[PDB]
Write a protein that binds this ligand. Structure first.
Ligand SMILES: [Hg+2]
Length: 72
């Protein structure tokens, strides 16, 4: 039952972009504990029990460019 921390650099030009990312993560409740989105750092932090590859894939399918990701 590990709650992992993933961090992504996601290009988000406006609040609609943060909204697109938030939306796909809401569909993965109740196994997403916390999300943090910063437009000022272009960063998305996801705290979840789900696998890294799956989270990355779902964010990428928004069409918002994912520049990089890592586990913390
Ligand atoms: Hg946007």
């Amino acid at each position: 039952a590990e709650i992992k921390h993933y961090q992504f650099n996601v290009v988000m030009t406006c609040s609609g972009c943060s909204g697109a990312v938030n939306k796909v993560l809401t569909k993965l409740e109740p196994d997403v504990s916390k999300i943090d989105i910063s437009l000022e750092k272009q960063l998305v932090d996801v705290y979840t029990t789900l696998p890294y590859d799956f989270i990355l894939e779902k964010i990428k399918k928004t069409g918002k460019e994912v520049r990089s990701g890592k586990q913390l």
